[PDB]
């Protein structure tokens, strides 16, 4: 079962949990009324993988590739890991599929506090567009991900404030409907 929990109040070393205490632990219930949602796949089989069909076919991910994010490998590594963790929002959908490894996407609540989503092998999730997020690899700092897209995919960043965009204002439109 994935595991998300409410953030203690350190700002010191992100890629340690953070767990708030006592604990507050969030279930994929309340995360669906953020808009994000989550699947559990068998990640040994994702070059072919009936169960990711569905997923793709049903929610239109046309377009994927496979990242890997490791300080001897990855370009322009720790750019790139300086700019996944700053809080920002993207004007598509973020949806993520761990094939290897482990990482923290970090989400806004209703309240605009801090979840901390884990995700590891086998779990994928999606961040709607407009969701205030960010990522950062746990202690064991390394991931493998499939990243998917609808369509020809743009991965631009906008570092919050974001707050003028469609996207930003539709999602907004979106929580008000939620539980
Ligand atoms: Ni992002």
């Known amino acids: 079962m994935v595991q998300?929990?409410?953030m203690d109040?350190?700002?010191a070393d992100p890629r340690?949990?953070?767990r708030a205490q006592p604990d507050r632990p969030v279930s994929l219930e309340q995360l669906?009324?953020?808009g994000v949602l989550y699947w559990k796949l068998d990640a040994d089989k994702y070059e072919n993988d009936p169960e990711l069909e569905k997923i793709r076919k049903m929610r239109n991910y046309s377009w994927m590739d496979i990242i890997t994010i490791c300080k001897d490998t990855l370009p322009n590594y720790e750019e790139k890991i300086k700019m996944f963790f700053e809080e920002?929002?993207?004007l598509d959908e973020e949806i993520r599929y761990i094939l290897e490894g482990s990482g923290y996407?970090?989400?806004?609540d209703k309240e605009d506090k801090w979840i901390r989503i884990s995700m590891e092998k086998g779990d994928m999730i999606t961040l709607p567009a407009g969701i205030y997020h960010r990522f950062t690899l746990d202690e064991k700092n390394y991931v493998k991900a499939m990243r998917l897209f609808v369509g020809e995919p743009?991965?631009?960043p906008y570092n919050r404030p974001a707050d003028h965009f469609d996207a930003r204002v539709q999602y907004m439109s979106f929580l008000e409907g939620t539980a």
């Open 4 to 6: 998300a929990w409410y």
């Open 9 to 11: 109040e350190s700002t």
């Open 16 to 18: 340690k949990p953070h």
């Open 32 to 34: 669906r009324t953020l």
């Open 88 to 90: 920002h929002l993207h």
């Open 105 to 108: 996407f970090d989400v806004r």
């Open 154 to 156: 743009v991965w631009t």
